């Protein structure tokens, strides 16, 4: 199964529904839906991440990037670095990835 | 069914490769499409008729439209840039039949 | 169908222009090339254009340029609405008139 | 359509072939009837058939080999020279561009 | 016929367009295949499981793996660069179950 | 009457040239590549050309160049000299000057 | 046409494959019969089948990997080696020692 994460971009470019979310090239989730935020009119992406990948730090970032010859776009989730002395919080169902890089 | 929409107009100097069914997008998200393109008989300037999805009916009249191109197929589209709001300063919301005054041709 | 009126234009070279080629203002098609013939006296290409009558306030200072569309190299006529001067009064193009200012391929 | 004959010599005819069009300002006025090498100089001589209605071409006119559209098909562009003497059946266009 | 094989592992930062059954080659000659790609659960780093033909069982542990692209279709593969051996120190050979430490991501 | 006569030419490399490849002068086709063979003694490619018989005044100073339109042979008519009277190529002769591609 | 066998080692065979042509001056004289990695050197070894009529190839000849026209298909250009007024001729089973990769 999966859990939900949100992320806001200034521009989603060629991103679409079912666009893959990957970590190190490995698909770990997918874009479930894309909506304009009703109050800010900023694109918000709704992600469905496979539940086995449930130790993602909230310091992680999302980048829109392009794969192969067809110009297919995807989300690169870069696992942010945490420091056990400082104790970084883990992303949970319904949480938002705050750090994003648009296209 | 088809999603309900309302009409907005916009005048450009040149519409370029824009055509019917050309998409209108905000931040890359499609919110409407070009319903029709006609030359204004009195000004001889191209007027675009847009159909915008009714859920996006809080677009300030300070918003702008820009003609831009998407990837490999050379498809052109309208990039709608959301304007600044402030009711005190009298920034009105766009309604059915209104015109987007600020446009950038390409 | 929209009725039309006719205008003439002479070019040095009409290039890939052909019958039914579109005439546009600001990218909006307002007419088409009805016919292309060589002038018997000058041997210069003369294009016969059909313009929609609703657009019958085109200044005689307007110009025609042969231009290309991106995807296939198909050619068309771009009509640039000429400058008018409130001081001088608007000399408008009528059915059968000729556009003097032209730019060939 | 009736026609009359004109000749022209080039250094290289490139992709020019039989049935290739001859045009003035993009308007087709004739066709390549034949392509032959001059027996003494071995320079390509093109034989053109021009429609008789276009019989006021000055001998100061020139011929240019040019390419049209996407397929690289070549044609002859006849550029009317500034006027003088008119070209008649059997005459040669002196000025050519390969 | 089919060649028997032994297993090697390799970790990358990014495997890019690499997939299962992606080829492993030395000097353009295919000597193995990607058997599996899994994200390490504690580190979330891609771990590639390689099957190398047993006849090529004298690969030094100083060898490297690079992700590279093949001609027209953008197909990716693993280029195994045979590592430097040292007559003075005697470099250790990779055997079944070992890990290739030197890797170059995309 | 025979439609063509034979000429030979050796190149270092014939490239994409093949049988039925055209031979042209100033873009006008005057012959065809009949065959391509390696000289058994030198292992250098030798092309065999069939030239239309009406083109029987080609000077032996002429050259052959491999060019692209698919590849073809451009025959460049060689310089003649009224003083020396340069020899004309006949059936079975060899074009000495060649340009590979 | 029958054939005889020749071997050649490269550092990298690139886009070369079985049935890739072997040519002299653009004329095809053989084909690549097989490509295998040498278990002892871990260098690609190419097995060539050459038409028997071309049996006067000096052992000083070289092999180069090269590209043909528009599709990037690769081939082997056999460069006929220098003989000296006496170089040994390559026979069935011999190896072309001089090779140049792409």
UniProtKB/Swiss-Prot annotation, chain C:
Superkingdom of origin: Bacteria
Keyword terms of this UniProt record: Cell inner membrane, Cell membrane, Membrane, Signal-anchor, Transmembrane, Transmembrane helix, Transport
Keyword flag Cell membrane: yes
Segments forming a coiled coil: none
Localization, UniProt: Cell inner membrane
GO molecular function annotation: phospholipid binding; phospholipid transporter activity
Region listing for MCE/MlaD, in residue ranges: 4-81
Topology of the protein relative to the lipid bilayer: Single-pass type II membrane protein
Segments on the Periplasmic face: 1-105
Any one Gene Ontology cellular component term annotated for this protein: plasma membrane
Signal peptide start and end residues: none
Subunit structure: The complex is composed of two ATP-binding proteins (MlaF), two transmembrane proteins (MlaE), two cytoplasmic solute-binding proteins (MlaB) and six periplasmic solute-binding proteins (MlaD).
Described purpose of this protein according to its UniProt entry: Part of the ABC transporter complex MlaFEDB, which is involved in a phospholipid transport pathway that maintains lipid asymmetry in the outer membrane by retrograde trafficking of phospholipids from the outer membrane to the inner membrane. MlaD functions in substrate binding with strong affinity for phospholipids and modulates ATP hydrolytic activity of the complex.
Protein family: Belongs to the MlaD family.
The protein, known as: Intermembrane phospholipid transport system binding protein MlaD
Underlying gene: mlaD
Residue span relative to the full protein: 36 to 140 of 183
UniProtKB/Swiss-Prot annotation, chain F:
Subcellular location field: Cell inner membrane
Chief location of this protein within or outside the cell: membrane
UniProt keyword terms in alphabetical order: Cell inner membrane, Cell membrane, Membrane, Signal-anchor, Transmembrane, Transmembrane helix, Transport
Periplasmic compartment spans: 1-101
Keyword Manganese in record: no
Region annotation (MCE/MlaD) ranges: 4-77
Alphabetized GO MF terms: phospholipid binding; phospholipid transporter activity
Domain of life: Bacteria
GO cellular component: plasma membrane
Keyword Ribosomal protein: no
Entry membrane topology: Single-pass type II membrane protein
Function, in words: Part of the ABC transporter complex MlaFEDB, which is involved in a phospholipid transport pathway that maintains lipid asymmetry in the outer membrane by retrograde trafficking of phospholipids from the outer membrane to the inner membrane. MlaD functions in substrate binding with strong affinity for phospholipids and modulates ATP hydrolytic activity of the complex.
Subunit structure: The complex is composed of two ATP-binding proteins (MlaF), two transmembrane proteins (MlaE), two cytoplasmic solute-binding proteins (MlaB) and six periplasmic solute-binding proteins (MlaD).
Family: Belongs to the MlaD family.
Protein name (Swiss-Prot/TrEMBL): Intermembrane phospholipid transport system binding protein MlaD
Record organism: Escherichia coli O157:H7
The gene coding this protein: mlaD
């Amino acid at each position: 199964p999966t859990y939900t994460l949100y992320a806001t971009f200034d521009n989603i470019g060629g991103l679409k529904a079912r666009s893959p979310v990957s970590i190190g090239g490995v698909v770990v989730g997918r874009v479930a839906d894309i909506t304009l935020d009703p109050k800010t009119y900023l694109p918000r992406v709704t992600l469905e991440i496979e539940q086995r990948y449930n130790h993602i730090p909230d310091t992680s970032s999302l980048s829109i990037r392009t794969s192969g010859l067809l110009g297919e776009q995807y989300l690169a989730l870069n696992v942010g670095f945490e420091d056990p002395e400082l104790g970084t919080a883990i992303l949970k169902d319904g949480d938002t990835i705050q750090d994003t890089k648009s296209a």
